[PDB]
Design a protein that fits this description.
2 copies of one chain form a homodimer. Chain A is an alpha/beta fold. Chain A has a single domain, classed as Nitrilase/N-carbamoyl-D-aminoacid amidohydrolase, CATH 3.60.110.10. In chain A, α1 packs parallel to α3 and α2 packs parallel to α4. In chain A, 52% of the residues are buried. Chains A and B meet through α5, α6 and α8 of A and α5, α6 and α8 of B. Bound molecules: nicotinamide (NCA) (6 copies) and chloride ion (CL) (2 copies). One nicotinamide binds next to loops of chain B. The PDB classes it as hydrolase. The entry lists the keywords amidase, amide, alanine 145. The assembly is dimeric. The entry is titled "A C145A mutant of Nesterenkonia AN1 amidase bound to nicotinamide".
């Protein structure tokens, strides 16, 4: 409804089904969602992991060129600008098929790429055959009056990855994902702890429905610092729109000891 | 009931109210619980943080001598032996009042002290005025056919502390605690994640009721590797007895990167 009294940030999450190896289709879906989110007063749209090509790691490595990635990237940049909304997307990285990772990028409403990140924690043998793991910590940046950060999918299941973002100042962690197999423990158990154990908000945007030989769970969610869902979807396509309201674990943690004990 | 087919470990958790600065009373309560647990076929009893003197940090530092600590320790050792049950207790450490931490120790049914641990993550200004933080990682040891470990209270709220135990091989993490203030997020949100994110079982033994100017929450619980409660108490004194049944986060985590990013 109307933009509320105590809130200066409204975010949207796109939950949908991608078609493998059909970027025109999947990017048309992103464009649709961007327009709709913008019309509802959202200032940012989060979209799912590898959405533009589908979550099909082995086929991305075999069939998707660098030039095809770049064409999808340019189109997404154009959607951010033309729909007048900040956009988080996830594509393969820009290098050749044998050198690139899974990435996420944040563009603002003018189309500026503010931040780029390469997934550090690859999931399973197919991802590890198709992609190179990232080696850099999550980025943290001011946008819309808060410190935003990016992580991808499996990354968020590691407390260390969320802690790395929060140690840099993150307040809002945005996570494209691709979770199938009725893995209710990730949104149900791990995400709430990630939020509480850092005092942060996390947004988690999944595929749903039949795609790439899997049936994705949906369950997209925004979790606030008390671990509660600010908004959530079920198993069907949807656009989740959430107004964010404006123990000291981060100070208390004995990081110099912890780093020796991992 | 009868010791079940698929289980070779039955554990007990004592949840009760301590009297500040009255070790005879509080250790009599531990003895009672040890006897009862042993009669029910439990092989180990976990008891709460600082139970023998009450959770009264400032008064422990002002009034409880080293010699008084040692007398309580010897009595607890005797309860393990005389009740024929392994026992986890938590007392101040053995040094002078200005040099000692909060500790936990595991004795076997013969009274052998198998392991000792000093709380690394002190909670709040009163603990930090009264006790020295520990500097050593959690111990991990074979007992009863599994790898057991110790952590104390606030420690378990840090993913790094549980990860440190699991990295050493822990399967069962035993946690004396003292949690008041209706802090439902610790057992409700953090403990289940600790268990899932390492694939371990955790046992969490709280005070309950009015003690030391607080009203403790109870909520003692054993959480298995899927994050579910194997057994749980409410707010009243009780003895929880649980039979333990017999993603690869621990291998997949990029620990050499994580250690640079905390
Ligand atoms: N954004 C607003 O102007 C507004 C007006 C009335 C009620 N809520 C919000
Ligand atoms: N995908 C990306 O992260 C990226 C970063 C810089 C340039 N092109 C792509
Ligand atoms: N896409 C992912 O990183 C993933 C898939 C399955 C489980 N957890 C994470
Ligand atoms: N421990 C046992 O002998 C037993 C016997 C029957 C049923 N369950 C356990
Ligand atoms: N409380 C303890 O940890 C301890 C260890 C060794 C000797 N005495 C006490
Ligand atoms: N006893 C503790 O370490 C403690 C107290 C309050 C909150 N969390 C932990
Ligand atoms: Cl919340
Ligand atoms: Cl479980």
């Amino acid at each position: 409804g109307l933009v509320p009294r105590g809130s200066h940030m409204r975010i949207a999450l796109m939950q949908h089904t991608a078609r493998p190896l059909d970027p025109q289709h999947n990017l048309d879906l992103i464009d649709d969602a961007a327009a709709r989110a913008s019309e509802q007063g959202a200032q940012l749209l989060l979209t799912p992991e590898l959405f533009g090509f589908g979550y099909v790691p082995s086929q991305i490595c075999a069939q998707v060129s660098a030039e095809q990635v770049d064409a999808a990237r340019s189109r997404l940049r154009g959607i951010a600008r033309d729909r007048g909304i900040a956009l988080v997307w996830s594509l393969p990285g820009p290098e050749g098929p044998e050198q690139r990772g899974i990435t996420a990028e944040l563009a603002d409403e003018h189309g500026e790429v503010l931040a780029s990140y390469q997934k550090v924690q690859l999931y399973g043998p197919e991802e590890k055959a198709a992609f190179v793991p990232g080696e850099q910590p999550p980025p943290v940046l001011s946008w819309g009056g808060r410190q935003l950060s990016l992580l991808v999918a499996y990354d968020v299941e590691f407390p260390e990855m969320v802690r790395a973002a929060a140690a840099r100042g993150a307040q809002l962690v945005l996570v494209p994902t691709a979770l199938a197999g009725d893995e209710t423990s990730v949104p149900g158990i791990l995400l709430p702890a990630r939020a509480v154990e850092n005092g942060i908000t996390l947004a988690y945007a999944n595929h749903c429905g039949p795609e790439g030989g899997l049936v994705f769970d949906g369950g997209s969610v925004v979790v606030g610092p008390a671990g509660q869902p600010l908004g959530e979807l079920g198993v069907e396509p949807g656009l989740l729109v959430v107004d964010l309201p404006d123990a000291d674990y981060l100070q208390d943690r004995r990081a110099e000891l912890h780093r020796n004990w991992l």
